[PDB]
């Protein structure tokens, strides 16, 4: 907010001037070519740098950074080179230039992605000077160490008015993939939305932890556009780093790549589904050491469980739900009765509501494991977060911190959650969670103490009544 | 679920929705059906009154048994109008499998296209057979190179043809001969996995303890010996007789239908497999299913050495990894060819 | 109680679903009839009372308040409605439970009932267990044991509904014996118009970007939400001393008084408080002081006297969600009196009203006193 | 609801299966070819009649329904000829299907209409399957004297979920519209949305009255067809029956056609636009006599003006508002001056809030005449009208039966509005309308029954806390 909230402000004045998804669609094309010629542009000039290029020719040449980044951006059809020709009839050349980086067929593609920014558009000339004030206007961003997508996180997360994360929970479940375990990989996600839970571990761990790139999978098709350039605006490796198109419960992809080492979620909630199911979909590798399906008003546990398949023999799971997911008959007991068959699920911490972009509800984390001890323990968390006014809270380092001291080893902390046992769950009807807030606020009081002051009230009462019998004199 | 060519291929289920069923009949264009024989059966003996009785109807069948393979062809004959029924299969009934039933020619008509597995295996789609036995004992070799197939069905028992001393040298022979049958003459050689399936339940529950108690002696001869995870598994039974002249008997689900000296053997087998591989499986409705499955799976992978086999494992399971079988049974025309197309694939 | 024994809920007590209502016809004014009676406040307008298929809400039964809620408990008053989303509590014996003994045994414990978090029904959780029985001296003096009790609460209720009664007549008859005396001023008492008392300020409002205009602070600062009081000595909200750097605000003195001109008043009455520390108020009110001719109590209870009516003389000002203007709000002439009938007049109705009022030295300082005491006599009666 | 509402719940079944606006297009274009097959084959077969027809080829016969309806269906592209050959290879025929009507050069043409079904669309079997799946959805519609377009009504309304009339509202404003004028003409709109409240009147006097067909203006290009196609539905004759397109603000006309004789209209609220103004539209011919413009966030009574613009020497007009448009500052104020420069304004009614879908205000009734006598009335009027549940209320024919009782010849009615004078709207700054509700609900009491009653609450009071007294041993 120092030189940034400025900045965060221009990209809410450059936020004109139609329904924001429509422009917003070529806004976040021009910053994505934009970045990726700066990015070619540094890589191919650290050192002579030159504001316009030539017609070098050297294929030979060309092809490393397309082994290297995979495209060549072109020899002139730079952003810089272009943005001297600006107002310059025509602009639709910008679809030839999608065509440049869209070769790529060694090594790995990871292309066939820009389709983005269509044509509508009325006429030519309203197409030319709408596409030109909208290059020139983003042109004018004084970004330029280079920390650029947070506005691109602003404007993501400037819609839905979907709900993705508050980013500090997201920073907080990535503390719940944690800890000590450099071990491959991270990460997977089932229905990822954004790239932005996706971020934080690698982000923080550039070299400390080296594991892998990240892989996903999510529901639509222009988020999953969105969520393509928002992992790759972070300066990301090129290595295996994707995530592909389809949903977990009708394609469930990887299998043979790989039982998954940590894994982080947000399912969206209510999600109904083909039911029940007229495939085979009972006797799939997942679903048959249940017992019973997920039907569809209780769409929610075949996440949960297709998230359980993907793990590894040590490294830990973490994923949100709300815990409405309560008992929710028979079905939803059955798979909650396997769920606790062994020590999968290890931890459950409640959340406080809001904290979100009115939904209103509170929500929980489970966090699973087969890394067992074993017995259940339900460190569920109530107040204190603010929630509404700006984001809010957002939120409170040291309370995240010391819930990640709570989570270390086990203390039994009144005021707060606690331990639980095996046998007191089976004593439950497996229930999420009851157990174990304690406090009331139940404060006793005094006879006496009390019943003098009423006398002292009294005392008052009757010659403040025989004054007002004074002053019934009419 | 495996139609899915083409997208969306309608390929629509009731399960077991015989309203749901006659409503797909009501329902168009979902042009393809696919349904068991006893969903169309329930259909034909619980609703008489269909529309589709005076129409257009294809059918093709495949996988044939022998509990409807004439009542529901009865009631296709009884409750149908216009049908034109085609068959495929790898069961030929016609000269001398069945021998009192309703031949395949005779169920359906003309032999219209045939593809032998001759061809296919000089095109390289299966491999060759090198068929053995075992003559290697002088004791029993009257009774292993019998052939009255009346004394084999009856005088079958536990000491004539079942004998510790004939078992222990059946078991010395294959323990001598697997790592070497299966490639395995050098440490950092390949592999390959082997089965071993007989005809009786008592001869495997002898098994186990011979092949696991012999281990025990060979790795005490002389500390050196590397052993064979070895596993096993069936449930029950030859319940019917299912098939034609001659094949494997189906073995159904119901878990404890035997004695628990069969089935609580077959749970203390399970419980040190556990012990070794950290699985969950009991032996109830559930477990014991997926358990199938689950050994199904890592028997592929080439993780289990040797897997002991009563009636399972011989029609629809495949393993490409799997190049040598042992036989201790008597068996007949192509039942005994689908035993044998458990190894031949490439 | 010689022999207490703990029983379960549900083994004596019918539970039953509501009968089938559609009570949400066209109009229920005052005019109609019927008690429509939810949670909260359980009181609804009328509606015609009869062939609707109403429950009709016979001698004693019970309700519980709700999905998601489980804790609200009223007591059914005589013969009432089905009001929406009730579920009805009753007993299956009459010999033993006589319920209203329940009722008052139910909100013993808010245990639980002090949980409304997650969205749950609770049905066959309450529904279950417990509560303590004069079982097994039963059917002999069972009941009769609890006519003592029974009747502690009852004068206990009788007692807080009838403070809450003469709590509301005492409002109602001094404002009543307010302005037929002090109005009509003869004569002449002098039509001073507003302002022409005091130079009154206007507000102000900071925004909540700058953190360190916001987050600390001891100024007093002053909005209509947390109106609604009266004789306001502190509020929700301390604003920071920086921000008056670009506040737009004035700092006021320490005995001013303050008046709404948003968004109760366009429907309702105006409020106003005496403010009694220096503080500041928002865009959406007026803070005035007068000007050393007066006693400042008595311009504070002349226009709580006269809202009603200047309210009236600025009212609709637009179909917005604002209220009255500012000029005939200023334009209005209230009847100003020499200094006698300042300080005496407005001594005696100034210990009227604060005989009346919150907190010390009033009568709800009775009421949640005795409401306290009540709840504690109730837990103390109720163990073994 | 009778055998309707049956058939309105069909209507809410055919309403699958995606986004209702892209399907909705082919649904209408539907219906209304299906409408326009059955009015021609009535009108062609009324008395041989034939399910096929054949080609008779007589084009001279041909063109008299091309001069009195405009437009041959054709030989055989009828619907019910086209209903035999259903799910038939292949579907867009239907394109050449819209050329046939769309010939009608002569006379007046009122074509250039049916440009809505397009393709959308991924393959052609796709298609195929999916427009003969909406042809055998609305075949299957029994409704058959021949009541069609209430089921429209209602599939227009289902949207925007724009907002147009709840259709009593309309009703209301066609009854201000009234009354004994045989008076060529009726009825000019600007802004006109739908057709919905250019309805009323005319199909109430089909025979009753009779002065010429319906003029208006409309902004969309969409709702423009819509409303086209909406009009014609109901029967109406092709004689010079027609809405332009364009805005009144940048458009005006018909100037030349003509001054009115009685106009309703809708305007939308708070339609800022190009300020302050750029060209000379002070110096036009309707807002001159104004004196000042209507700048953006008081862009309303620029279509008031307009409004009056085109006014007889006699006929009364009737036009919508909120009521928040009060002063609004002296540029409004002045307006609002020249506004009551005569009795140019004669009546305002208002209307208690919402009685529409969830805007949530109130509103208000201008009723204009240059017909005097003259003093201003403000009859304005509040509750009852019930609002929310339903539609609702909907809404009470006695109700306003008295209200056009009241409005007949000026009553003075008090807990109702009444008369006020000129010198009270001078001594007003011209608002609108506070004066002249009374009622208040201020009710006396007696000192005495108060006082007593208050005396028996103490008598209750002590002698219960002299028990509770007693009830404090422990």
Redesign the interface.
């Known amino acids: 907010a120092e030189l940034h909230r400025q900045i965060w402000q221009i990209a809410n004045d450059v936020r004109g001037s139609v329904d924001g998804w429509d422009f917003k669609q070529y806004v976040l094309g021009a910053l994505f070519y934009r970045f990726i010629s700066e990015n070619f542009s540094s890589y191919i000039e650290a050192g002579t740098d030159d504001i316009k290029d030539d017609a070098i020719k050297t294929k030979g040449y060309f092809i490393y950074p397309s082994q290297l980044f995979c495209n060549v951006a072109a020899k002139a059809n730079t952003n810089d080179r272009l943005n001297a020709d600006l107002n310059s009839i025509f602009v639709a050349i910008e679809s030839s230039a999608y065509g440049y980086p869209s070769e790529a067929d060694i090594k790995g593609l990871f292309a066939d992605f820009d389709t983005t920014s269509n044509r509508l558009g009325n006429t030519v000339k309203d197409k030319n000077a709408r596409l030109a004030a909208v290059l020139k206007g983003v042109e004018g961003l004084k970004l330029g160490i280079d920390l650029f997508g947070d506005a691109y996180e602003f404007l993501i997360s400037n819609y839905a008015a979907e709900f993705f994360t508050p980013q500090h929970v997201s920073k907080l479940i990535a503390q719940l993939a944690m800890h000590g375990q450099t071990h491959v990989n991270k990460i997977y996600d089932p229905a990822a939305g954004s790239g932005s839970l996706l971020l934080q571990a690698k982000k923080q761990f550039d070299n400390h932890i080296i594991e892998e790139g990240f892989f996903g999978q999510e529901i639509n098709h222009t988020t999953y556009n969105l969520a393509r350039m928002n992992m790759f605006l972070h300066n990301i490796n090129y290595d295996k780093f994707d995530i592909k198109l389809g949903n977990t419960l009708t394609e469930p992809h990887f299998r043979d790549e790989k039982p998954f080492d940590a894994i982080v979620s947000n399912p969206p909630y209510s999600v109904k589904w083909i039911g029940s199911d007229?495939?085979?979909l009972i006797n799939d590798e997942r679903f048959?050491?249940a017992?019973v399906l997920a039907p569809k008003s209780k769409a929610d546990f075949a996440f949960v469980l297709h998230a359980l398949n993907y793990l590894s023999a040590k490294g830990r799971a973490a994923i949100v739900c709300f815990?409405?997911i309560?008992y929710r008959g028979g079905a939803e007991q059955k798979i909650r009765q396997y769920l606790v068959?062994?020590n999968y699920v290890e931890t459950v911490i409640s959340l406080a509501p809001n904290l979100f972009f009115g939904t209103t509800?509170?929500v929980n984390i489970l966090v699973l494991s087969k890394h067992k001890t074993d017995t259940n323990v339900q460190f569920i968390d109530?107040s204190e977060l603010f929630k509404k006014?700006?984001n809010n809270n957002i939120l409170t380092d040291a309370h995240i911190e010391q819930i990640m001291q709570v989570f270390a080893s086990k203390e039994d902390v009144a005021h707060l959650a606690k331990s639980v046992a095996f046998e007191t769950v089976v004593a439950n009807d497996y229930n999420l969670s009851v157990s174990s807030?304690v406090e009331?606020?139940?404060n006793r009081?005094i006879?006496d103490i009390?019943?003098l002051?009423?006398e002292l009230?009294?005392t008052?009462?009757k010659i403040?009544?025989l004054?007002?019998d004074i002053?019934?004199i009419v | 679920?495996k139609e899915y060519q083409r997208f969306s291929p309608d390929s629509?289920?009731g399960?077991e929705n015989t309203a749901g069923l006659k409503r797909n009949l009501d329902k168009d264009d979902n042009k393809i059906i696919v349904t068991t024989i006893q969903k169309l059966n329930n259909l034909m003996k619980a609703e008489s009154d269909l529309p589709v009785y005076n129409q257009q109807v294809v059918f093709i069948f495949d996988e044939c048994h022998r509990s409807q393979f004439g009542e529901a062809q009865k009631n296709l004959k009884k409750k149908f109008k216009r049908y034109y029924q085609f068959g495929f299969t790898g069961t030929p009934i016609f000269p001398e499998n069945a021998l009192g039933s309703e031949t395949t020619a005779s169920v359906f008509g003309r032999e219209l296209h045939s593809y032998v597995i001759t061809d296919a295996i000089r095109d390289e789609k299966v491999l060759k057979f090198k068929v053995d036995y075992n003559d290697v004992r002088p004791q029993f070799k009257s009774l292993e190179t019998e052939t009255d197939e009346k004394k084999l069905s009856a005088a079958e028992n536990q000491q004539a043809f079942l004998h510790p001393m004939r078992i222990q040298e059946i078991t010395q022979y294959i323990l001598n001969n697997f790592r070497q049958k299966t490639h395995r003459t050098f440490p950092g050689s390949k592999g390959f996995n082997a089965m071993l399936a007989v005809s009786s339940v008592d001869a495997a529950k002898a098994y186990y303890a011979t092949f696991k108690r012999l281990q025990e002696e060979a790795a005490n001869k002389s500390a050196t010996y590397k052993p064979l995870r070895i596993a096993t598994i069936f449930s029950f039974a030859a319940n019917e007789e299912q098939n034609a002249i001659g094949e494997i008997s189906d073995e159904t689900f119901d878990t404890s239908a035997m004695d628990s000296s069969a089935k609580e053997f077959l749970d203390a087998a399970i419980r040190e497999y556990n012990s070794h591989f950290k699985t969950?499986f009991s032996t109830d409705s559930?477990g014991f299913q997926?358990y199938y499955?689950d050994l199904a799976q890592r028997v592929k992978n080439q993780d289990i050495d040797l897997l002991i086999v009563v009636g399972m494992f011989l029609t629809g399971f495949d393993a490409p990894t799997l190049n040598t079988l042992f036989v201790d049974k008597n068996l007949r025309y192509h039942g005994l060819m689908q035993a044998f197309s458990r190894t031949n694939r490439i | 109680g010689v022999e207490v024994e703990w029983l379960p809920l549900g083994e004596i007590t019918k539970y039953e679903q509501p009968t089938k209502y559609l009570v949400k016809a066209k109009d229920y004014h005052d005019t109609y009839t019927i008690p429509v009676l939810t949670a909260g406040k359980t009181f609804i307008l009328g509606y015609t009372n009869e062939t609707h298929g109403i429950y009709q809400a016979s001698k004693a039964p019970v309700i519980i308040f709700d999905d998601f809620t489980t804790a609200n408990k009223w007591v059914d008053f005589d013969f009432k409605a089905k009001s929406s989303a009730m579920k009805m509590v009753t007993s299956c014996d009459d010999n033993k439970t006589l319920l209203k003994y329940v009722y008052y045994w139910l909100n013993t414990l808010?245990?639980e009932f002090?949980?409304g978090?997650?969205?749950?029904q609770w049905i066959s959780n309450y529904s279950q267990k417990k509560i303590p029985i004069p079982c097994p001296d039963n059917p002999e003096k069972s009941l009769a044991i609890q006519s003592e009790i029974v009747r502690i609460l009852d004068k206990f209720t009788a007692l807080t509904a009838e403070l809450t009664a003469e709590l509301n007549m005492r409002k109602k008859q001094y404002n009543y014996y307010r302005d037929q005396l002090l109005s009509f001023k003869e004569g002449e008492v002098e039509w001073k118009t507003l302002g022409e008392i005091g130079k009154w300020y206007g507000g102000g409002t900071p925004s909540?970007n700058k953190i360190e205009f916001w987050e600390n602070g001891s100024i007093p600062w002053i909005s209509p939400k947390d109106m609604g009081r009266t004789l306001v000595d502190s509020s929700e909200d301390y604003i920071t001393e920086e921000a008056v750097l670009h506040s737009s605000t004035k700092l006021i003195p320490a005995n001013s008084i303050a008046i709404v001109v948003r968004s109760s008043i366009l429907d309702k009455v105006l409020p106003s408080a005496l403010i009694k520390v220096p503080a500041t108020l928002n865009q959406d009110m007026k803070a005035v002081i007068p000007h050393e001719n007066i006693l400042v109590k008595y311009i504070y209870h002349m226009i709580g006297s006269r809202g009603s009516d200047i309210l009236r003389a600025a009212k609709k000002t637009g179909g917005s969600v604002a209220s009255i203007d500012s000029k005939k709000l200023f334009s209005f002439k209230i009847p100003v009196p020499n200094i006698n009938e300042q300080q005496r007049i407005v001594e005696?109705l100034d210990?009227?009203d604060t005989?009346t009022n919150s907190i010390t030295?009033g009568l709800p300082?009775?009421i949640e006193?005795?409401q306290?005491?009540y709840e504690?006599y109730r837990d103390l009666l109720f163990s073994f």
Do not use: W
């Open positions: 007229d495939p085979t048959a050491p017992g815990p409405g309560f068959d062994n509800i509170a109530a006014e700006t807030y009331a606020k139940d009081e006879i009390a019943e002051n009423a009230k009294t008052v009462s403040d009544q004054r007002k002053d019934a | 679920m629509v289920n399960s969950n559930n997926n499955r | 808010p245990s002090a949980e978090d997650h969205k749950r909540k005696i210990k009227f005989l030295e300082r009775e006193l005795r306290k005491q504690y």
